[PDB]
Design a protein around this ligand. Structure first.
Ligand SMILES: OC[C@H]1O[C@@H](O[C@H]2[C@H](O)[C@@H](O)[C@H](O[C@@H]3[C@@H](O)[C@@H](O)O[C@H](CO)[C@H]3O)O[C@@H]2CO)[C@H](O)[C@@H](O)[C@@H]1O
Ligand SMILES: OC[C@H]1O[C@@H](O[C@H]2[C@H](O)[C@@H](O)[C@H](O[C@@H]3[C@@H](O)[C@H](O)O[C@H](CO)[C@H]3O)O[C@@H]2CO)[C@H](O)[C@@H](O)[C@@H]1O
Length: 298
């Protein structure tokens, strides 16, 4: 009745076995060096921490080569429709120079498969930004969510929007991302994909509904989502195909690197790359700590 489990990602090596580790140059052109599973384990970038799954970055060595070492995991399995529930004890902090993201990417050529940014932000951001990226012909309505809509056109080249800004909604809770999120011991992000739209709920630690982690969660009875992407201005079924889950932490690049000098991180260094390269200790908080990752289907 409602939803049923299709995949419990487990923890540790069993969890890592369900992902492919991306090691190519960063598609978002950041100052990052994505390493293999073996190199990551050898550098302490991945592992298990008291039953929870850890994924972080190099906060020890001055960077060299492509950039600061990190990992990008992309799930082996993909999902058409469903409910993605992640319980995090910790997420990458609001650290200057960083650009963490837990998101989904459709199959096929970009951007026809669509993409969903569930948890994403840059540098010293306070609020989480939930965003969709699609081909042309997809805009969203203004109701059904607690967050504040920033952009309404999901097309990667929407007319007056920055390139690939997509259609984003900003959370109103300062504990929805980074520093605040970690200070309260994290929380739960549930993402629902249907042929009529996408919804994302953020439940700060201890405020989650009693069935969110169980066998049959029912979003219909949950409080208002933080972000809802729906409306007749988009063919929801056609704009998104099978999605794979992705975890990553990049540095500088297209977004973080370009807004480095405009925000509160500007005074830290002349530029993002210099900061990330010479201040390894600043990235200790840039890690994911997963309590559980479960995917359900209608
Ligand atoms: O166009 C050249 C490459 O595109 C790759 O697709 C990328 C896309 O280019 C990139 O902008 C996008 O970045 C993601 C954001 O859209 C959003 O979803 O947030 C993500 C997390 O921060 C961010 O990475 O990612 C797309 C998928 O990697 C093609 O994959 C690549 O083959 C092609 O050369
Ligand atoms: O290209 C040089 C030019 O960059 C401007 O900064 C842009 C950057 O180029 C864009 O790629 C970036 O876009 C972000 C998206 O990639 C992201 O997915 O979503 C965010 C959120 O709304 C987008 O901002 O935006 C920045 C800032 O507009 C510099 O401003 C400009 O001076 C420089 O010449």
């Amino acid at each position: 009745e409602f939803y049923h489990l299709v995949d419990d990602y487990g923890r540790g090596n069993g969890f890592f076995d369900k992902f492919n580790f991306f090691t190519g140059d960063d598609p978002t052109h950041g100052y990052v060096d994505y390493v293999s599973r073996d190199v990551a384990a050898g550098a302490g970038l991945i592992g298990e921490r008291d039953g929870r799954t850890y994924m972080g970055v190099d906060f020890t060595n001055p960077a060299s080569g492509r950039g600061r070492r990190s990992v990008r995991l992309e799930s082996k399995n993909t999902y058409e429709h469903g409910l993605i529930v992640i319980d995090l004890a910790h997420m990458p902090g609001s650290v200057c120079g960083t650009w963490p993201a837990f998101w989904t990417l459709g199959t096929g050529d970009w951007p026809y498969g669509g993409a969903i940014d569930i948890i994403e932000g840059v540098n010293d951001n306070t609020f989480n930004h939930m965003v969709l990226h699609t081909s042309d012909g997809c805009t969203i309505d203004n109701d059904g969510f607690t967050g504040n809509l920033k952009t309404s056109n999901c097309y990667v080249y929407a007319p007056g929007q920055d390139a690939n800004a997509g259609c984003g909604i900003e959370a109103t809770d300062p504990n929805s991302y980074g520093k605040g999120f970690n200070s309260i011991g994290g929380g739960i992000y549930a993402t629902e994909i249907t042929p009529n739209g996408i919804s994302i709920w953020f439940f700060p630690r201890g405020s989650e509904p009693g069935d969110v982690l169980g066998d049959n969660p029912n979003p219909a009875n949950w409080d208002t989502p933080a972000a809802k992407f729906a409306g007749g201005g988009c063919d929801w079924e056609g704009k998104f195909n099978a999605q794979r889950l992705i975890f990553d932490v990049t540095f500088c690049g297209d977004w973080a690197g370009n807004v480095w000098g405009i925000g509160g991180c500007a005074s830290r260094a002349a530029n993002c790359v210099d900061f990330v390269r010479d201040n390894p200790s600043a990235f200790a908080e840039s890690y994911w700590l997963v309590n559980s990752l479960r995917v359900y289907a209608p």
